[PDB]
Nucleic acid binder design. Structure first.
Lengths: 315, 299, 315, 299
DNA sequence: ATAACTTCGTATAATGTATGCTATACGAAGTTAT
DNA sequence: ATAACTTCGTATAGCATACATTATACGAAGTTAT
DNA sequence: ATAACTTCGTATAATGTATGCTATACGAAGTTAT
DNA sequence: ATAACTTCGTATAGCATACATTATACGAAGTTAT
C-alpha cells in the first residue's frame, strides 16, 4: 500500500518528534520481532495477530519481565498505528494474551523492581568522607550526588545542565533551570533550588574544573586519570558515567556487589529520587509537596517508594 | 459469524486473561439474560438494543441496585466486545435508560451500603467474652479478629496466610501476637511451614492443618457473623450489613485510627488504599470530619 | 426522515434521563422559537442556520441577557444533536453571531448578577430576633435558614430531605445525607454536618411540627395561618416557598424592596452559599476547604463570590 | 467554492465576533504565509499540509519562538475552520513537525521571557529622583508608576481610567493617592468627569485632557522605558525585557507581595488572576519558594 | 598500560486514571467426620 | 442428626491496569590522553 | 376573607478547562504643536 | 528641527469562554383550610 509507505516515510522524516530512546527501542523490538519471524517462516510487517500472540508467549517463555513484554507490544502497536494500520492490540488474540501473560507471571511471584534508596544519611556519610578530598573527580562526584538528592532530577536532566542555566537567589542559593523532562516539554520549564550546603559543593566544583569559561559549557564533564577536567559545550557527561558515580560511591562505602546478577544491588540513577521521597514522607512533608518536588503531577509512584495501628492497639 | 466463532475461540483459549470470579459473574449474567429472552420471545445473541433496554427496566422493576444493573450491562458489553459485535451500551436507547434508571433510583432514595464497623469497643467486648475459653474455635476466632482488625487485610488475603510467612506477616500488636501464638499452639499448624495459618475446627474440637486447602472466605465471614450472633442474638429482623462481615474490621479499624487522629495517607497505607474515596466514606460521620462551617459556627 | 422521528421518540420516551428543568426549558425555548418562525413565515424544525442567527439577534434586540441568549441556542443545539441532525452551532453563521452577541453586550456594560449575600452576621441577627418566637412558622424558618447557611445546600436539595436522611454524630450533631445535587447523581452521595446550635433549631422544629411521625415525611413542610404544620411524605415544601422564607426574612429586617424591578434586591435561594463562601475566605479557611464545603470541584465560582498592597506600601 | 464564499461572507458579516487585535494578527500571518507561498511557488489557499510544514520549518530557521510558530499555525487553522476547509494542524505531517520543532527548540535552550521586575527598591529610587520636580511629565510619570505598582492593572486597563471612575478606581495607597492628586491639579483633567485620568503632555510642558482620545498603551510602555533610560542610560546592548515595560509593575508587585509573605489567593485576587500558573512563575526565584528539600537539607 | 570514559544493545521502570475487572456478601445446597 | 464447614449463585462494593510513549539499568566492547 | 401556599412561564445563573483568542512588546514610520 | 506622542506590524506572553445541560429568580394566577 502507498499510504502505508508514505505514513511511514513521514514518521521517519520527522523522527525528532520522538525521543531518540523511543527510536532505539522501536528498532530493537523490530530486530527481535524480525528475528523471530525469520525463525518461523513468517512475514514480519503488516504483523499478523496470531503471529504477534505467539511472539509474546515466546518472550514470556524466555523468562522476560512483564513490562518488557509490554514494551515489545507497545512498539509494535506504534509502528502499525502510525503506518495507518490496525494495532496488533486491536485484535482479541493479542489483547487477551497480554492480560494472561501479566496475570500468570504476577501470580507466579514476578514483581517490578525499584532503585535502592539514596537518603539523607547516605549523603551525609558520603559527604563527610569525600569533602576532604582535593581530587577533582571527588569534588565533581560530591557535587553531582548533592544535586541529585537535592532536586530529584533524573540523570539525563542533570547531564543537560549548562553553566548559563544556573542563576541565584538573594540568599545566595543556586537555582537551576530545567527545560525538558520525561513528563514535560516547554520553554517555561521548571526551576530547582539548591541548599547553601549543596551550593558550596557545586561552587567548589566549578572552581576546580574551570567549566565557567564558557556559559555554554555543560556543568558536568569528564575528568581524566590526572585530575584534569575536560569542559565541553557540545559533548555531555554521559548518563552511563552518572550511573557509575552512584555505583562507585556505593562501592566506596559497602564494597563489591554479589555475583547474583540482580539489578538494584547498588545505588543507581534513580536512587536519589526513591530516597528523597522516603525522607520527605518520614519528615511529615505533605503528599502534595513531595509530588511538587520530584515533578510528579500524581500520587502513585510516590506511594510505592514510601512503603506499625500497633501504636494504637496498646492502651 | 466466522469472525465471532474465532473471537469466541480467542476467548476460550486465553480464558486466564480473566479471574474465575469474573467468569462466574459473566456466566451468571448470561443465564439471567437468556432466561429473560426466552420468556419474552427475544434473541439473546447478538443482543439488540431495544431488548437490552427492556431487560434493564425489568431488572429495575425486580428491585436491584443501580450498581447491579451496571454489572449486567457491563458483562453484556464484554460478551460483545470479545465477540466482534457492537456493545449494547453504545446504542442510544440503552444509554438513555441507564441515565433514567440511575437518576430515577437515586430519587427513590437508594443508598450504597458498607460494612457495619467492628471497632475497639467491639473487639475488647469480644475479648472479654471469650478470652478465658479453652475451646479451639474460640482461640482461633480471637486470633482471626485480632489479625483482621490490626492488619485491615481482606478475607481472601487472610485465607492465604501461611506460617512460613510469619510478628511480621509478608506488623502485629503485642496482645495480638500473643493470641495468634495460643492458636498456633492448640492448632499445631507449625508442623509444616507451608500449612495455612488458619484451618478448620470440627465439632470434636480438634484442628485440621492443611497446605493444600485453606479456610474459605465464607468461613471467615462466618467467624464475624457468629461473633455478632453470640452477642446480639439471631440476626436483625432481610437486608444487608445487619451483622459484621469481611470488611467490618477494615471499616472499624480506620474509624478509630482517625478518631484517634493521624494522617490520612497513614490510614491509606495501612489498608493499602491509594484512592482516598473509600477511606473518607468510612470515616465520614465522625465529629473530626464535620468541616469548616461547623468549626466556624461553633467559633 | 424516519431516523429523526425515532431518535426524537427515543429521547421523549426516556425523558427521565434528563432533569425536568431541562425539559421545561426545551419546551419554553421551542415555544419562543416557534413563535418567531411563525411571525416570519419560517420552518421551525430542522432549524436553518440563518434563521437561528436572526432569532438570536432578535433576542439581543429584546434586551435579554447574554446567558439567556445562550440558553436558547443551547436548547436548540440539544434538540438537533439528539435528533441526529447537525447543531445550529455547527454552522459559522450561528457560532459567529453568538460570540458577537456576547462581546457587544459585555462591551456595552452588561454583567451577570449574583445573589445578595446571607452571612454569619445576618444569621446571628435573624436568630436573635426569631428564636424567641413560639409561632411554628418562625421555628421552621429559622431551622431552614440555619441549614442553608450551615451546609451551603441548594434549595431543591434542602426540600428533598426526608426525616430518615437525618442521622447523628457521637457528639450529638445532626448529619444529613444528600443523594442528588446539580453536579452529582450517585447512591453514595455526600453527607452534611450541622453545628450544635443549628441542630437545636432543627430539633425544635421537628418537635413543634410532628414531621417525625413518618421517617419518610419531608423534613420541611407547609404551615397554615393557624400555626399547624402539614407533614407529607409525597409533597415537598416548594423551592418557591423556600425563596419566600429568604425574602420574608430580609423584609422583616430591612423593609420593602425598591420598585426598580431588579433581581437580588433581597435574600434568595442562593444567598446562603454566596455568604458562607465570603465568611470562610474572611476567616482564612483554605481555598480547597471552601470548595469542599459548597460542593465545588473547582475554584472559579468561589472567586466571583469572594471579590487593600496598600497595607504593604505603607512603611 | 460557494460554501467557502458563504463562509467568508459569514466571517465578514460577523467580524465583531473577534477583537481587532485578533484580526491584525490573522492578517499579519496571512500576508507572511502568502509572501512565502509566492516566493516558493505554492498555492496559499487552501493551504496544503506539505506546504504548511515547509513553511513552519522556514519560520524555525528564521529563528522564531515556538509560541510564535504556534500563532502562525493557529491563525492558519482559524482561516480554514471559518472557511469550510480542513485545518492544516489535522494533517499528520504538520502534527509531526510541530512536535519536532517544539522538542528541537527546547533542546537548543529557548526560554519564555517575562517583564523585568519593577519593585519597591525601584519605585522608591525613582520617587527620590523626580519627586521634587515641577515638570508636568515628571508629575504624570510618578502618578502612572504609582497606579501601575499599587493596582497591578494592565496598560490597556490604565489608559481607559476616567476621573469619574475615581482613592477607589472602578484601592490606592496613601502617598499614591497624594501623587495622583498632584497630577490631577497640574493636568486639569477634572474639568470633564469623562476625561481620561492620563493624557498627553507636550514639549511646552502643558497637559491636554481629552474624553475622546486616551493615552496609547505604547505611551504607557514609554513611561516605563524612559524611567529606565533615565537611571541606567541607553537600553542594554537587541533582545527583549532589557528595560521595564507594561507588566514590569505587575511582576515586581507580586514579588514584594510574596517576599513580604501573604496568601497566594490574596496575590491572585490583587492582579485578577485565577490560574496560579503565572503568579508562581513571577515569584519563583525567591528564597521563600525553594521547596521542601532545601528546608530539609538546611534542617 | 590504564583510568576514566563513551557507545551500544537488551532489558525494564515510569508516567496518570476511568470504568472494566475483580472483590466481598450472604442465603443456601452440598459434604464429611464426629 | 448436626457442627462446621465448602461450593455455589447472584447481589453489590471496591480496586488497578491498558493506553503511548520516554526514561533508566548495566555488562561489554571500543577509545584516548596520559 | 385571607394567610400561606402551589404551579407556572419567562428569565437567567452555574457547573469545569484547554487551546483558541486577545493581550503586551517594541522598533519604527507617521503626525502635530511648539 | 524635535518632543512627545499615535499608528503600525509582527513578535511573544497570557488569559477566558464554548461546550451541555441543570439549577434558581420572581411576578402572577390559582388553591384551600381555616
Amino acid at each position: 500500500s502507498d499510504e502505508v509507505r508514505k505514513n511511514l516515510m513521514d514518521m521517519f522524516r520527522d523522527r525528532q518528534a520522538f525521543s531518540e530512546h523511543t527510536w532505539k527501542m522501536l528498532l530493537s523490538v523490530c530486530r527481535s520481532w524480525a528475528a523471530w519471524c525469520k525463525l518461523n517462516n513468517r512475514k514480519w510487517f503488516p504483523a499478523e495477530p496470531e503471529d504477534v500472540r505467539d511472539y509474546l508467549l515466546y518472550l514470556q517463555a524466555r523468562g522476560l519481565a512483564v513490562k518488557t513484554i509490554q514494551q515489545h507490544l507497545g512498539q509494535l502497536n506504534m509502528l502499525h498505528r502510525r503506518s495507518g494500520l490496525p494495532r496488533p492490540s486491536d485484535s482479541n488474540a493479542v489483547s487477551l494474551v497480554m492480560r494472561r501473560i501479566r496475570k500468570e507471571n504476577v501470580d507466579a511471584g514476578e514483581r517490578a523492581k525499584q532503585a535502592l534508596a539514596f537518603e539523607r544519611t547516605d549523603f551525609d556519610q558520603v559527604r563527610s568522607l569525600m569533602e576532604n578530598s582535593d581530587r577533582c573527580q571527588d569534588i565533581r562526584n560530591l557535587a553531582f550526588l548533592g544535586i541529585a538528592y537535592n532536586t530529584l532530577l533524573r540523570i539525563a536532566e542533570i547531564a543537560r545542565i549548562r553553566v548559563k542555566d544556573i542563576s541565584r537567589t538573594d540568599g545566595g542559593r543556586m537555582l537551576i533551570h530545567i527545560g525538558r523532562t520525561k513528563t514535560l516539554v516547554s520553554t517555561a520549564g521548571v526551576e530547582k533550588a539548591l541548599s547553601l550546603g549543596v551550593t558550596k559543593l557545586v561552587e567548589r566544583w566549578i572552581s576546580v574544573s574551570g567549566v565557567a569559561d564558557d556559559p555554554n559549557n555543560y556543568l558536568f564533564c569528564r575528568v581524566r586519570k590526572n585530575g584534569v577536567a575536560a569542559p565541553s559545550a557540545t559533548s555531555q557527561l554521559s548518563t552511563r558515567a552518572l550511573e557509575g558515580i552512584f555505583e562507585a560511591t556505593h562501592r566506596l562505602i559497602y564494597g563489591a556487589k554479589d555475583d547474583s546478577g540482580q539489578r538494584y544491588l547498588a545505588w543507581s540513577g534513580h536512587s536519589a529520587r526513591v530516597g528523597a521521597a522516603r525522607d520527605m514522607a518520614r519528615a511529615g512533608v505533605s503528599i502534595p509537596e513531595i509530588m511538587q518536588a520530584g515533578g510528579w503531577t500524581n500520587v502513585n509512584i510516590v506511594m510505592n517508594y514510601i512503603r506499625g495501628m500497633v501504636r494504637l492497639l496498646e492502651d
